[PDB]
């Protein structure tokens, strides 16, 4: 048969190209050339062609030769898989060490040696942290296991896989070296977040959600459990981080591996089309697509025998980047997979020309094409015109294997459903809707009677004996004991908080149905749950979040216990807000979700049920004064002083029958205060117990996801180190503690305010637009000053009032100040304090620096040579410009220099010339102020409103003057700029248009 | 860190027997597969340890001597050689014969141990090395060498019997199981088997030159070998 002949030819090609370097004993092929080193990602991608050939050969059964060939191919794949698994098992200690405190020095080595499975490179001469490699390893292992191949083999290997899944699940808040193992464009020993890593980790987690690694013969003890919260967080960071490549890279060609056949980890097909169009426009060439803009790999310069390039890449790599046909093969795979036929034909025709023949006329795919050193200026002046030459590894295993797989799929010998038994091709199908079920439970008989009187039918905590309701901390402790082994020294999953998507699904433990309340409602963890308005609104947010994604199979279920804390002052009826909320739920609509109230037994018929198979079987004078003192605030102060002097954990001996430690007394005081609902000492108690807001790291990472900088406390020059990369919970807590210092209230206030911005960003990402950096101390001082102005009180009174407000009050006031709603001088103060700048300000500043020698800001200087080092889209531009412009500590003067730079840019747009000198904004604003004073004196103004700023020498009327108008500050600023330009021009004007 | 080969083979035997006993049930709760693995993994570890020494096999083929023999004790954590030739000898062919015979037994019962053709070639060269057992002395199963224990090697009946049984089992056997073709079989020279039988059938009543009788003859004429088709002599 002709098909048999074609299959034999393909098998011969595979044997001649890839399988000839099988490297027995271990089974890990060398990464081409004279390297003698094995890469996990390279081998995993190379084995794809062999797996596809084996799958194709398996169909033509009933013959000894074909069966033997298919068996040999499958067993070679299995041998490679086992070799890689042994290689990863060699570093269980490193994996376990990385499981706590994620650091670059605790991750397993990405570079692995040849046979004998040893380490070829130490822990400091290479970047041994690449989540992409282990992620694609897990994903393809799951795919082959679902296909029918047996790879995962023992319970110990299952435990190792579970531990490695726990290790990789934290990919959405850690820095990575990327696929290229070089971090950002400049190596400099730095790492940054990458979209490919997080997306492919999400795909790997989704693939292994409930896979039985032992096949059809496996039991409940050989399954892998993966939570859904991490997958949704990864989906979120991918959605919020995919208008570009990463924080520093505007576009990277490896983004195809996320929006194509590899792992299919993307939704919102319009985003996929936009990304493909962008990469086609900005990367395609005559011999493939470049890896990314401004890359120095394989160039005739920059001393190829060197590393850690200095920042001098204005043009040396621009428009001369090498092109890789591997992304062309990725394009043909993407076209041939989903629905495209003509794209596959055109891309195959394009790729056939760039191919280079080998021994016996075998096709070979070169690694990359490089521009000859002689024809560099021609390429610079005429892009994509010169002819490149083959270079790099001629038999590129990755590219050749991908091309072979694509050709095999295009020829029709293989189907898209064979390589993807998990049906990941339909990840872009829109989700119609989802219905969320809620259940309301009463703790005691009185609550149930109260809701019965109010027309609400419910069931108490009792009378549901088969069903048990426990807090989410219990569930956290449950999941902490997963994948624990003593022989392998495995500590299991580290303790972590559980989101709504984890507690919603039902759990079966010891043949008993277990339901868990949402984690937020724990009053002991934090006092945020005390406020009823806060409660109702974040329940709205929680319901919205649950109904948004719900990527898990089955219907959801929410259990709501009505405690004794939200009752009225008389303690006889429910509050108005909770009653309105439950009435809304009874009507089938709350927030943005459809809800049907019912019984737990009714919801038990259909829901998301999970089975946990792994749990089958004078000091005395001070004490007397504290006991006898009134004025509970003074009591809290005395408790603080005794705790800090000599009461860390020592017993106070207040009682005689029982010895109660200081912690017990503090807990009792907190409980007593919780019933009076007096926000006068809750903050101090919270600071003393050092309670930290749950999911603080999640808030930090979702805030940093949108290219923002965070800062804690009032700013002096030395302290307040900026935050630019995600950091673990311990480091974050230590940083906020050192920022708060001895105040002990700055820390809790910072936590509350920052979780508030984190909550507000997801709901409304429009108030934080055109922000770049968020400074917590400055906004703290801002709201303190606003409270002082509103109450016409002192700073201390403003602070006590601010402390005394309810959490809903802080949320409302921060929302108000974020909108900037409620004089002109005050408004300028708020603008400067929060450093509000227009969106196009940075393009204007870049153009001004291009057209001017420099800018003087009354101190230091900003050279114009930085425009070549730097681009408008770079966050380095943001940090440098902000650092230059924040030397003046006056919000008003800050806004003055913003408007001065704006009018200077308008003038530079008007006049077509080169200034050729350093311009000082301080001189311009001083000249404008002098002109305003002269105009006021001429008009007839007296000395009382001709005031002088005690620290800046600027008239108050200038601040109070509106920006626009016949006598607005803008006209005076333009006049001052024109006077300066005339003073720095050759006795004439060069303004024409 | 030391780990012998015979003990691992017998542990794999126990695991395989327990898996076979469990196979009689339809609902095993994923237990038969685990023990079947355990056997597979032990066999694959032994095979990998042997494959790590190919030049040793090549030297054994040409000039079989105790100084150029395969090691019998490897590291339990990394699969590395631990003790040199000057302290252990490492000349033991009974372990190799038992490994080959047990691999035959497991494949015949139905298993997947050998993956690629290179493993088939290595097994064939191992059989080539074993075919010349009847001339070289060995330290024996007891790794002492003789009763005197003076670092002297001598021919042993048990080793010869185990080698003969392994050659009989590896004759024409297909290493690929049911999913095999004509290019996955092992060939055995008849003259080597005849020489081994001639060397065994005459020294069988004793154990060796210095041993009138030994307990190590029991495995040679019992369950693991069954290499004595004489009845009266047995």
UniProtKB/Swiss-Prot annotation, chain A:
Q: Which residues carry this modification: Phosphoserine?
A: 883
Q: Where is the lipid attached (S-farnesyl cysteine)?
A: 990
* UniProt cross-references to InterPro entries, sorted A to Z: 6-hairpin_glycosidase_sf, 6hp_glycosidase-like_sf, GH15-like, KPBA/B_C, PHK_A/B_su
Q: In which pathway does it act?
A: Glycan biosynthesis; glycogen metabolism
Keyword Heme (UniProt): no
List localization entries: Cell membrane
Biological process GO annotation list?
A: generation of precursor metabolites and energy; glycogen metabolic process; positive regulation of glycogen catabolic process
| Molecular function as annotated in GO | calmodulin binding; phosphorylase kinase activity
Activity regulation comment:
By phosphorylation of various serine residues. Allosteric regulation by calcium.
Q: What is its main location?
A: membrane
PTMs per UniProt: Although the final Cys may be farnesylated, the terminal tripeptide is probably not removed, and the C-terminus is not methylated.
Keyword annotations:
Calmodulin-binding, Carbohydrate metabolism, Cell membrane, Disease variant, Glycogen metabolism, Glycogen storage disease, Lipoprotein, Membrane, Muscle protein, Phosphoprotein, Prenylation
Job of this protein = Phosphorylase b kinase catalyzes the phosphorylation of serine in certain substrates, including troponin I. The alpha chain may bind calmodulin.
The name this protein carries in UniProt is Phosphorylase b kinase regulatory subunit alpha, skeletal muscle isoform
Biological source species: Homo sapiens (Human)
UniProtKB/Swiss-Prot annotation, chain B:
Q: How is it modified after translation?
A: Although the final Cys may be farnesylated, the terminal tripeptide is probably not removed, and the C-terminus is not methylated.
> Which of UniProt's keywords are assigned here?
Acetylation, Calmodulin-binding, Carbohydrate metabolism, Cell membrane, Disease variant, Glycogen metabolism, Glycogen storage disease, Lipoprotein, Membrane, Phosphoprotein, Prenylation
Transmembrane segments annotated in the record for this chain: none
The protein's job, in short, is: Phosphorylase b kinase catalyzes the phosphorylation of serine in certain substrates, including troponin I. The beta chain acts as a regulatory unit and modulates the activity of the holoenzyme in response to phosphorylation.
> What is the protein's quaternary organization?
Hexadecamer of 4 heterotetramers, each composed of alpha, beta, gamma, and delta subunits. Alpha (PHKA1 or PHKA2) and beta (PHKB) are regulatory subunits, gamma (PHKG1 or PHKG2) is the catalytic subunit, and delta is calmodulin.
Q: Which family does it belong to?
A: Belongs to the phosphorylase b kinase regulatory chain family.
* Annotated disorder: Glycogen storage disease 9B: A metabolic disorder characterized by hepatomegaly, only slightly elevated transaminases and plasma lipids, clinical improvement with increasing age, and remarkably no clinical muscle involvement. Biochemical observations suggest that this mild phenotype is caused by an incomplete holoenzyme that lacks the beta subunit, but that may possess residual activity.
Which protein, by its recorded name, is this? Phosphorylase b kinase regulatory subunit beta
Q: Which organism is it from?
A: Homo sapiens (Human)
Q: Which residues of the full protein are shown?
A: 80 to 313 of 1093
